[PDB]
Amino acid sequence: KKVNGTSYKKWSFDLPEMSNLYRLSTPLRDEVTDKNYYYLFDKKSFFNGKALNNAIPGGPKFEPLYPREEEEDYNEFNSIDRVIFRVPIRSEYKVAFPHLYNSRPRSVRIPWYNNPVSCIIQNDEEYDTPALFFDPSLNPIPEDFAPLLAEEEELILPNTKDAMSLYHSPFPFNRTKGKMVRAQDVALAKKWFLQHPDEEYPVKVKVSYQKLLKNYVLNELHPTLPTNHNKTKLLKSLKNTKYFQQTTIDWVEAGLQLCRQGHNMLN
Amino acid sequence: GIPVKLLNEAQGHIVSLELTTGATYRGKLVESEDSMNVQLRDVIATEPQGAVTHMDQIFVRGSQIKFIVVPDLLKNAPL
Amino acid sequence: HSSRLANLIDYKLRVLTQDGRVYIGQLMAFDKHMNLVLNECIEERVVEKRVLGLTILRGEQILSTVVEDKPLL
Amino acid sequence: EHTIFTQLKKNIPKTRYNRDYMLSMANIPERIINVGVIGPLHSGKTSLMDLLVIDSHKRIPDMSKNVELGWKPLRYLDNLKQEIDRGLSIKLNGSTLLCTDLESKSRMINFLDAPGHVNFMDETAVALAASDLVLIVIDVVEGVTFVVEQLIKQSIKNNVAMCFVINKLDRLILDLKLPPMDAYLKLNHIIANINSFTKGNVFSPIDNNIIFASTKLGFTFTIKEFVSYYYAHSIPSSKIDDFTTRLWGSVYYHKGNFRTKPFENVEKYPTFVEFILIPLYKIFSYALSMEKDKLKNLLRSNFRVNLSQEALQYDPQPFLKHVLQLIFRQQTGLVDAITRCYQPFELFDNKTAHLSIPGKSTPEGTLWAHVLKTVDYGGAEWSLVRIYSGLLKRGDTVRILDTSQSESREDDETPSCEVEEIGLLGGRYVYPVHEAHKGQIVLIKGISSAYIKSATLYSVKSKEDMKQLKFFKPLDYITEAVFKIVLQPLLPRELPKLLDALNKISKYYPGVIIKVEESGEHVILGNGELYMDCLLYDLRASYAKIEIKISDPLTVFSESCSNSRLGEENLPGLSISVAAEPMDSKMIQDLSRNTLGKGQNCLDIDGIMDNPRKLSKILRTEYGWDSLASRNVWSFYNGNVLINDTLPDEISPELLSKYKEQIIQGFYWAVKEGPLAEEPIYGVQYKLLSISVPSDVNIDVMKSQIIPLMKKACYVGLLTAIPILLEPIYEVDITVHAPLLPIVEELMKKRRGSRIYKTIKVAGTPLLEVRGQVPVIESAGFETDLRLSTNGLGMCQLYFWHKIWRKVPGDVLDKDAFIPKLKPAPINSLSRDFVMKTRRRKG
Amino acid sequence: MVSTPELKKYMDKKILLNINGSRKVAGILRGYDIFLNVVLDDAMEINANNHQLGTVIRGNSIISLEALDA
RNA sequence: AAGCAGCUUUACAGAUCAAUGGCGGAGGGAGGUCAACAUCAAGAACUGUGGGCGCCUAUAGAACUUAUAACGAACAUGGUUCUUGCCUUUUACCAGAACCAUCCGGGUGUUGUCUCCAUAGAAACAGGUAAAGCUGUCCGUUACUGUGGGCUUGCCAUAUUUUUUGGAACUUUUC
Ligand SMILES: Nc1nc2c(ncn2[C@@H]2O[C@H](COP(=O)(O)OP(=O)(O)OP(=O)(O)O)[C@@H](O)[C@H]2O)c(=O)[nH]1
């Protein structure tokens, strides 16, 4: 019931399984739930921040992609003496409404705007709080027919609370039915260099964030779409015939056989 | 019931009807009822004699209606 | 009940009225008042005939019902 | 023809109820209706329409599996790459749709779905003009914030039926985690809070003007519907509708016994909570937390519902939807309350009057109908029209008019064209129509040549009726342009295309106001940052492909006085002395609200068309407005009031009553321009002090003469009057969680608008609504300083309502106090800066 | 039941009613009922000899209702 | 939502024990870090080929759209060309742009199988495609009853003005 079978693909679960799992995983994952948090840290503000060559304080600083800043013309239009100077016009603006501040934008992807500002409340301190609990920090603000589900006496269930806590989770948890991934296919720490450093960090780890956002952008910007219908997995093919046969072993041992193996072949 | 809904659906189209009186009325139908009251405009009455008339606004009582005859497009209408 | 009345649905019928006229055509709808809806109707006053179309008869006016033909394809 | 229609067949993904039955019900006047839908940002409008669309079609293709279940919500009525990449509806889109009621008898309906974003209010304006009633839709969290007040105020001010839908209840229970009794006083609390803003009526859950929903979960409550679907099968059909009235508003049944007494016996929650909120909570919290079969047995037992093991197997959310969308059926409860909440006879003359001079003359016998909007669908451009009188077919030659040329009021008065084609709006698809009937809204083809913006359409055989018929106002766009950006094409040889580019925009976008200066540099006026952005994108992509050039964000100042006089003709046969006066902030505030004068409200200055004894009755009565001046009030402006004030007037009265056109035409000429920036003049009363007139006037008195004279008289009028410089201010709405308040304070300071005008807590949420003021010219990039600074928390809207114009902090003419370029200007000296600057683009 | 008919538009206006037995009456429409009983003032019979009466016409009888002046 | 009746089934005793009619079956389930051979974003519309009776289905090519909303909520390297670099150049990089590769995977179908399991059987015969009960025959219960299950049902019960507890009855003249 819990999985496909021996081929081990395509798992599945039930709730408290998750809720436990999540509760345990959470120290590893501190990630802001709402998309609305990320604004100029999203993907498209990084693209536009590239195509237009803009520097975000927490964004990575890239190459021009258009080599030339050089055309500069004064003119009846441009003259300082006809233009009214108020406000700095920060870069971030030019990443915000890029058809507005940064003129002649090219290959510029139109950003998202305005999500609802998630107000979700959660108890990360007391777990003896019942299901529906007015939060301290909220503003003050014939006999035989009956209600339907009130037939059952009480709505709050031992699970339902963490059913709620799981109603919001990043991709893995909120889904209780999914399939299998290579171990390295999982990326644990990708989350952490998507976040604000806040302050207390040294410029070491901050600059590190800028590094990994840079690389991240690059890893995003180039999809592929190949297909290998030609190549049967090299093992599957080569293990055909004779000179190879299949067995089991302890891992470390196979390691050793390899150690002398290629050690030889070097010699 | 469906026999009433059909009526409500022909509101606005032009309708023919017959009463226990013996006369038939023809005109655009404006208001109906669950009783089967009617309210028509530009009516062209025709009794047993053949006597034609014009009535600007007209009411009926359902009890008095024998049978109504309604527009052709109202056969594709939903049941 | 009314199980028999649903069985008549979409058959050509011959309906005699208290007025004497006899209407003929398929049956589209039936009611709790016995209001009948008929498609492509013809009254037969009597060697006589007239074309109406869609007709909705009242319950008071109807006397009896009688099948002309089977349900049409 | 009909065959090309057949290759249209496989395009429009048909529908349950087919067409010709719907489009058959069309010609009937009393059926159909128009429904516009509005709420503030992210109310769920566009999504709600998504619900209705799926309650319509079976086949809608473009649903991915990924959307079918779940996680990413469908946008249909968001047809544009622009809308889809942004995530907010821009150009309102409807779906002409047939729906049914609880009583099963189906009305044809015109669905219109507007943007909620304040900058785009323009289309909501347009939406009103079409809509017979609106659904105002609320995020349950923020209740009704100020923008909503402005909304309802506007719609009632347009005499149009309403209903309310409070929405995203899901967000309430799940995010906010409300104990039921919190929630009931929530709903209630809001409903009172709005009824306060409801003049001359009140809404109420049983009034069926209030409808509950969540879109993302796709469910809807009208207690009529709700109960009927369920409790109806319980109790004898007599008591039921009574029991509806027995539901909301503090009523208790202890055992089968309805008693308003406190709650006695033991348990206490009111009847509403009893049959609605709690059992709902049980639906959610169980369907999340409950063993499936446990739910199943309840689905038969209570609800007569059946799960399929497919539906059994789902991640919590997509399941949970299918749960609800299954338990509730193809929401007609919405429609049903709409169904009964609109009165054709009562209000039809109200609204149809509000947009013209009422009459009425020429009933029927005519084709006359109201043209709102020139729209761009997948193919090219159609026109959006509501049909008041007549029928229409392809090719029918018809006569054209625009709303300004209906401000004018035989031959030559009409440019005319045929209907090239007629569509119905099917959202992403368009449904061809040959024949068009009274009352239904449709698209036309080929008429775009005729005009810009709002256009009245008519075809009439009777010069009787032609004289008798009336004409629609230029539509009030509920917020004024106020935002200014200079455009130049980057390659001035490219100049021509840009023009027609601009042209189409002035059509496709209602509120934008475009100019071409003397200098040649083109000018754009739009609501705010976002708005004119959407323009510029559609401009550098859709229409013109030309790479263009853009200025710094700008405002549009104005010219006023804070309190002698001569005037001279270059042939001094005229003797003119006109001083100027500041004017009443009371009359200012009442001019800001343009009304029909209903109630003690000071009548709009349009009511000088109502008796100058009536007008001067409002004046003398309310303002202490000088009775002599009230009889000396001559004209109003695009702006303030002009008065003939002196005895020499009466000395030469007929001489004046001859030339009054020369006076006022010269005067509109004046206040349109201005002495300082050639920008509008505001808050200025001209008492007309002295005139002499050329000797025995042998074609001596001419508009050519007196007009630019009195023009000067106005100019110097302001100049000696201690003129100041008017500025606008975006009225600021800010939405935050509480602890972040200090942050906002900071920013306000720096922006120098820095006005925290009100501070507000939001019922039962951790929310502060703050209201404030910041100057448009200081409003650049504000919203992103917010959104960054609060880490996405909070939210920002800069709206122009009440049109309040502050003073420019500087003295208009002081040459020295400036400090050089490439700096923000010193707060003590400004108006000199601003004015000299504009002038350098002027004189 | 008791669908209050559309006689709001006839209140305080002249009428030309028709009733059972081919008899008809003129009058100012004062009030109406659930079963369509009517209140007429200044009631005049139409035999062609017109007799002044001054009247409550019964509902069942009513065949129809006209308006003299637009 | 109980019971009654109707409908569907059902373990069935049955009429027939014929011709029938219905539903299923004429090659099972699932799972196999099992392989072989194919295929692989989606959609409307144009052209060509093939099959079946102008229409439908399959395959190939071209154009447009989707946010490239995603074969993988994964990303690694290499090559050619243009800007960059510098002197070095190689190893090679740097840092971008384009266009080409490779590699690590994934999914679907078909075929052949392997493991654990399933109980009638009619899983019997003959026709062909790229596919199959696809077709024809065929057989299992059976097409009309009573016991037992479920509902899709009666819509749930009104003699006093708008339908079903009657204003009906009766007579006579005209063509
Ligand atoms: N929590 C919650 N959010 C919803 C629900 N329905 C819609 N939303 C949010 O509404 C936002 C989009 O609103 P739309 O309906 O698509 O468009 P809109 O509400 O009219 O906003 P505009 O179109 O720009 O006026 C998305 O962020 C959804 O998350 C709901 O039922 N529950």
Sequence ranges of the domains in chain B: 1-79
Q: Which two tokens stand for residue D341?
A: 């909440």
Residues in chain C: 73
CA B65, B67, B71, B77 dihedral sign is positive
Q: What is the dihedral of CA B4, B6, B12, B16, to 10 degrees?
A: -90
Q: Which one-letter DSSP state was computed for residue D71?
A: S
Terminal CA-to-CA distance of chain D, rounded, Å?
59
Q: Which positions of D make up the binding site for GTP?
A: 39-46, 113-117, 167-170
Determine whether the distance from the CB of C71 to the nearest atom of strand F is below 7 Å: no
Residues in chain A: 267
State phi, psi for D167 to the nearest 5 degrees.
-145, 160
Nearest to D247 by CA among D295, D188, D314, D297: D188
CA distance C33 to D765: 56
Beta bridge partners of D317: none
CA distance D400 to D353: 20
CA A81, A87, A89, A93 dihedral sign is negative
Q: Same structural domain for residues D454 and D544? A: no
* DSSP H helices in D647-751: 647-651, 653-672, 703-719, 741-751
* DSSP H helices in D673-808: 703-719, 741-751, 782-789
> Rounded to the nearest 10 degrees, what angle do helices D703-719 and D653-672 cross at?
60
Distance D684 CA to F140 C1' (A): 101
CA distance D18 to C71: 25
CB atoms within 10 A of CB D170: 21
Q: Residue D538 is part of a domain; what is its CATH number?
A: 3.30.70.870
Touching B: which chains, 3+ CB pairs < 8 A?
C, D, E
Nearest to D73 by CA among D83, D63, D82: D63
Of all protein residues, whose CA lies closest to atom 4 belonging to ligand 1?
D216
What is the residue type of C62?
I
* DSSP H helices in chain B: 2-9
Do residues C38 and C13 lie in contact, with contact meaning Cβ atoms separated by under 8 Å? Answer: yes
The residue among D446, D479, D512 that closes a domain is D479
Q: What is the dihedral of CA C2, C4, C10, C14, to 10 degrees?
A: -100
Q: State the closest ligand 1 atom to the C-alpha of D116, by its place in the atom list counted from 1.
A: 25
CB atoms within 10 A of CB D119: 23
Using alpha carbons, list the distances in angstroms from residue C63 to C16, C34, C59: 6, 10, 9
Q: What is the dihedral of CA D205, D208, D212, D215, to 10 degrees?
A: -170
Nearest to D304 by CA among D233, D226, D212: D233
Do residues B64 and D8 lie in contact, with contact meaning Cβ atoms separated by under 8 Å? Answer: no
Nearest to D189 by CA among D737, D759, D764, D761: D764
Picking from A117, A126, A154, A175 by the largest number of D CB atoms within 10 A of its own CB, the best residue to mutate is A117
Please indicate if any CB of chain B lies within 8 Å of the CB of C61: yes
Q: Which two tokens stand for residue D689?
A: 């002090």
Q: Same structural domain for residues D156 and D122? A: yes
Q: How far is CA A138 from the centre of its chain?
A: 30
CA distance D379 to D398: 23
In sequence order, what are the residues at sequence separation of 6 or more whose Cβ sits closer than 8 angstroms to the Cβ of residue D163?
D133, D134, D135, D136, D203, D208, D209, D210, D211, D337, D338, D341
In sequence order, what are the residues at sequence separation of 6 or more whose Cβ sits closer than 8 angstroms to the Cβ of residue D430?
D12, D377, D378, D379, D382, D423, D424, D443
The residues lining ligand 1, judged by C-beta closer than 6 Å to any ligand atom, are A 115-116; D 41-47, 73, 75, 88-89, 115-117, 168, 170-171, 214-217
Do residues D210 and D166 lie in contact, with contact meaning Cβ atoms separated by under 8 Å? Answer: yes
SS3 labels along chain A: CCCCCCCCCCCCCCHHHHHHHHHHHCCCCCCCCCCCCCCCCCCHHHHHHHHCCCCCCCCCCCCCCCCCCCCCCCCCCCCHHHCCCCCCCCHHHHHHCCCCCCCCCCCCCCCCCCCCCCCCCCCCCCCCCCCCCCCCCCCCCCCCCCCCHHHCCCCCCCCHHHHHHHHCCCHHHHCCCCCCCCCCCCCCHHHCCCCCCCCCCCHHHHHHHHHHHHHHHHHHHCCCCCCCCCCCCHHHHHCCCCCCCCCCCCHHHHHHHHHHHHHHHHC
Do residues D782 and D750 lie in contact, with contact meaning Cβ atoms separated by under 8 Å? Answer: no
> Rounded to the nearest 10 degrees, what angle do helices D529-540 and D495-508 cross at?
130
- Would you put residue E20 in left (φ > 0), alpha (ψ -120 to 50) or beta? beta
CB atoms within 10 A of CB D788: 18
Nearest to D83 by CA among D123, D55, D54, D52: D123
CA distance D111 to D813: 55
CA distance E52 to E44: 5
Nearest to D190 by CA among D769, D767, D768, D763: D763
- CATH class (in words) of the domain with range B1-79: mainly beta
Nearest to D817 by CA among D805, D827, D802, D807: D827
The residue among D722, D751, D780 that closes a domain is D722
Q: How many CA atoms lie within 13 A of D104 on its CB side?
A: 8
Nearest to D444 by CA among D362, D528, D375, D517: D375
Give the nucleotide nearest to A218 (CA→C1'): F75
Residues 11-40 of A with CB under 7 A from strand F: none
In degrees, to the nearest 5, what angle opens at C-alpha D771 toward C-alphas D768 and D774?
135
Nearest to D558 by CA among D677, D719, D415: D677
Distance D120 CA to F148 C1' (A): 69
Listed as ranges, the nucleotides of chain F within 7 A of a protein C-beta are: 1, 6, 30-41, 43-46, 65-69, 71-76, 83-84, 95-97, 102-107, 151-152, 154-156, 161-164
Do residues D792 and D731 lie in contact, with contact meaning Cβ atoms separated by under 8 Å? Answer: no
Q: Classify residue D99 by burial, with Cβ atoms within 10 Å: 0-12, 13-18, 19+.
A: buried
One-character DSSP codes across D475-537: P--SS---EEEEEEESSGGGHHHHHHHHHHHHHHSSS-EEEE-SSS-EEEEESSHHHHHHHHH
Q: Which one-letter DSSP state was computed for residue D452?
A: S
CA distance C58 to D462: 45
CA distance D392 to D446: 14
Say whether C30 and B7 touch across the interface (CB within 8 A).
Answer: no
CA distance E25 to E57: 9
Question: Domain total for chain D?
Answer: 6
CA distance D573 to D697: 9
CA distance D284 to D288: 6
Using alpha carbons, list the distances in angstroms from residue D183 to A32, A141, A155, A262: 27, 10, 16, 71
What is the residue type of D471?
F
In sequence order, what are the residues at sequence separation of 6 or more whose Cβ sits closer than 8 angstroms to the Cβ of residue D683?
D560, D561, D582, D583, D588, D640, D726, D805
Cis omega before residue D545 (within 30°)?
no
Do residues D687 and D578 lie in contact, with contact meaning Cβ atoms separated by under 8 Å? Answer: yes
Q: Which long-range contacts (CB under 8 A, 24 or more apart) does A136-139 make?
A: A137/D738, A137/D766, A138/D176, A138/D182, A138/D764, A138/D765, A138/D766, A139/D761, A139/D762, A139/D763, A139/D764, A139/D765, A139/D766, A139/D767
Q: To test ligand 1's pocket by mutation, which of D173, D176, D215, D531 has the most ligand atoms within 8 angstroms of CB?
A: D215
Nearest to D322 by CA among D68, D73, D76: D68
Q: Which two tokens stand for residue B26?
A: 């023809």
Considering only CB atoms, B12 lies closest to which of D17, D29, D105, namely D29
In sequence order, what are the residues at sequence separation of 6 or more whose Cβ sits closer than 8 angstroms to the Cβ of residue D537?
A99, A110, D82
Q: Same structural domain for residues D349 and D439? A: no
CB atoms within 10 A of CB C11: 16
Sequence ranges of the domains in chain E: 1-70
Distance A68 CA to F84 C1' (A): 13
Say whether D315 and A175 touch across the interface (CB within 8 A).
Answer: yes
Q: Which one-letter DSSP state was computed for residue D29?
A: S
SS3 labels along chain C: CCHHHHHCCCCEEEEEECCCCEEEEEEEEECCCCCEEEECCEECCCCCCEECCEEEECCCCEEEEEECCCCCC
**Closest alpha carbon within chain B to E59:** B61
Do residues D709 and D716 lie in contact, with contact meaning Cβ atoms separated by under 8 Å? Answer: no
3-class state of residue D264 by DSSP: coil
Q: Which two tokens stand for residue C62?
A: 């109807």
Determine whether the distance from the CB of A55 to the nearest atom of strand F is below 7 Å: no
Do residues D726 and D830 lie in contact, with contact meaning Cβ atoms separated by under 8 Å? Answer: no
**Could you tell me the residue range of the domain that residue D610 belongs to?**
564-722
Terminal CA-to-CA distance of chain E, rounded, Å?
31
State phi, psi for D425 to the nearest 5 degrees.
-90, 115
Determined by: cryo-EM
Q: What is the dihedral of CA A20, A26, A29, A33, to 10 degrees?
A: 90
Please indicate if any CB of chain D lies within 8 Å of the CB of A166: yes
In degrees, to the nearest 5, what angle opens at C-alpha D821 toward C-alphas D818 and D826?
40
The strands making up E23-32's β-sheet, listed across from edge to edge, are E14-19, E23-32, E38-46, E56-57
Do residues D374 and D512 lie in contact, with contact meaning Cβ atoms separated by under 8 Å? Answer: no
In chain A, what is the greatest distance between 2 CA atoms, to the nearest angstrom? 96
Nearest to D439 by CA among D36, D132, D38, D133: D132
Beta bridge partners of D642: D635, D686
Sequence ranges of the domains in chain C: 1-73
Calculate how far, in angstroms, residue B50's C-alpha sits from the geometric centre of ligand 1: 65
In sequence order, what are the residues at sequence separation of 6 or more whose Cβ sits closer than 8 angstroms to the Cβ of residue D154?
D125, D128, D478
What is the residue type of D809?
P
Nearest to D727 by CA among D559, D840, D593, D590: D559
Beta bridge partners of D212: D166, D221
State phi, psi for D361 to the nearest 5 degrees.
-125, 165
State phi, psi for D696 to the nearest 5 degrees.
55, 20
Nearest to B16 by CA among C52, E63, C16, C29: C52
**Closest alpha carbon within chain B to C43:** B67
Considering only CB atoms, D28 lies closest to which of B13, B76, B78, namely B13
CB atoms within 10 A of CB D58: 9
CA distance D159 to D533: 33
CA distance D381 to D779: 34
Q: Which one-letter DSSP state was computed for residue D606?
A: G
Do residues D495 and D538 lie in contact, with contact meaning Cβ atoms separated by under 8 Å? Answer: no
State the architecture of E1-70 in CATH terms.
Answer: Roll (2.30)
Q: Which two tokens stand for residue A41?
A: 């840290």
Burial code (b: 16+ CB inside 10 Å, e: under 16) for D392-428 equals bebebebbbbbbebbeeeeeeeeeebbbbbbbbbbbb
Q: How far is CA A75 from the centre of its chain?
A: 47
Q: Where are the beta strands (DSSP E) in D390-489?
A: 397-400, 416-418, 422-426, 429-433, 441-444, 455-459, 483-489
Q: Which positions of D make up the binding site?
A: 39-46, 113-117, 167-170
Nearest to D514 by CA among D534, D486, D475: D486
Interface of D with B in 651-690 (CB under 8 A): none
Touching A: which chains, 3+ CB pairs < 8 A?
D
Nearest to D789 by CA among A60, A169, A58: A58
CA distance D197 to D178: 26
Enumerate the residues of chain D whose CB falls inside 8 A of the CB of residue B41.
none
In sequence order, what are the residues at sequence separation of 6 or more whose Cβ sits closer than 8 angstroms to the Cβ of residue A234?
none
- For chain D, what is the total number of helices (H) and then of strands (E)? 30, 32
Please indicate if any CB of chain E lies within 8 Å of the CB of B61: yes
CA distance D76 to D64: 13
Considering only CB atoms, D529 lies closest to which of A100, A116, A137, namely A100
Can you give the C-alpha Rg of chain A in angstroms?
Answer: 28
Q: Same structural domain for residues D673 and D600? A: yes
Interface of A with D in 19-78 (CB under 8 A): 34, 36-40, 76-77
Residues 144-183 of A with CB under 7 A from strand F: 171, 179-182
Q: Which two tokens stand for residue D471?
A: 């004409």
Which pairing describes strands C62-67 and C36-39: parallel, antiparallel, or unpaired? unpaired
Q: Same structural domain for residues D692 and D741? A: no
Q: Which two tokens stand for residue A104?
A: 């002649």
